[PDB]
Amino acid sequence: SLVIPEKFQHILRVLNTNIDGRRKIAFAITAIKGVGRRYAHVVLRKADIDLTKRAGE
């Protein structure tokens, strides 16, 4: 049988920083030194990202 699963990025490279794909996106993009928890949330709100999904999806 041929059922092709969706691809999942285990690691990400953002602004010369390695981001873990298994974290939730809001917490995942706080690995950047400049970015904190509130800045992550406001940026994701502006860029209409669903917050219930991990960084890999």
Partner 1 sequence: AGYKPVAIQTYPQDTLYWNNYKTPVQIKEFGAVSKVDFSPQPPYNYAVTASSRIHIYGRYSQEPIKTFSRFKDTAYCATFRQDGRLLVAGSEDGGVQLFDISGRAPLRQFEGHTKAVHTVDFTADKYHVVSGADDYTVKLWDIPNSKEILTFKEHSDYVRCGCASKLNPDLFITGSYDHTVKMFDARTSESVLSVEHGQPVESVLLFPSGGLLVSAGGRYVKVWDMLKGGQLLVSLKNHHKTVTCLCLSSSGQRLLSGSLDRKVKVYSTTSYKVVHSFDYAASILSLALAHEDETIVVGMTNGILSVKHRNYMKQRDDILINRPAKKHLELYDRDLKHFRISKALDRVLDPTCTIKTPEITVSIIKELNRRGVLANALAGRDEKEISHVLNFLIRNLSQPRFAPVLINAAEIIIDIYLPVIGQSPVVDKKFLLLQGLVEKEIDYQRELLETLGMMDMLFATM
Binding site for partner 1 (CB under 8 A): 1, 3, 5-6, 22, 52-53, 57
C-beta of 34: minimal distance to partner 1 in Å? Answer: 28
With beta carbons less than 8 A apart as the criterion, state whether 38 and 3 touch: no
Nearer to partner 1, 33 or 48 (CB): 48
Are the beta carbons of 49 and 27 closer than 8 angstroms?
A: no
Instruction: Give least dist CB 1 to partner 1, A.
Output: 5
| H or E, element range at 18 | strand 17-20
Tell the smallest beta-carbon distance from residue 53 to partner 1 (Å).
6
